């Protein structure tokens, strides 16, 4: 639904345009925290929400997590990046 923590999205701006990404936290109304999580070459970086297209997929995590703690969720959840 929303830009919920745990949402899978594609970047549509910049170098890393065409790549999935899982949302980890929320900073301001406009900015959120996105991790590539070491499936793909994207680090832990603040991005604008205009530059992401959200996918219906989702993941079970908490508001603010780690990279070794997300990779797990995608183990069984059934989500390749």
């Amino acid at each position: 639904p929303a830009i919920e923590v745990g949402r899978i999205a594609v970047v549509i701006a910049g170098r890393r345009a065409g790549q999935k990404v899982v949302v980890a936290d929320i900073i301001d109304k406009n900015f959120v925290l996105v991790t590539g999580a070491g499936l793909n070459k994207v680090k832990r970086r603040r991005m604008n929400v205009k530059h992401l297209e959200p996918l219906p997929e989702r993941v079970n995590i908490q508001r603010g997590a780690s990279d070794e703690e997300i990779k797990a969720a995608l183990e069984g959840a059934g989500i390749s990046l």
Binding site: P1, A2, I3, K29, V49, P54, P56
Partner: protein, 96 residues
Amino acid sequence: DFAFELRKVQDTGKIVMGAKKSIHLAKVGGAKLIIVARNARPDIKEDIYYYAKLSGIPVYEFEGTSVELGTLLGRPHTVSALAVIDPGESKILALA
């Protein structure tokens, strides 16, 4: 849309008019209803429908034009998209 219901929202509750703000509220959350005009840009229309069908916000398509919405409200300009945040004393959500 209904002149009387939307004017009652205008004076009792709170509205946020404009396509950028509407798209942002449909993407992050914080709106109750979104109203889009027939002839609005297909880009904006598609974005709104997608983000709101995901978030779970109802979208009403106003059959008239953007100019007509703007004039319905007390405004000399286009209002292609509109977001109802705070309803009040009106039955506007009852129309979607």
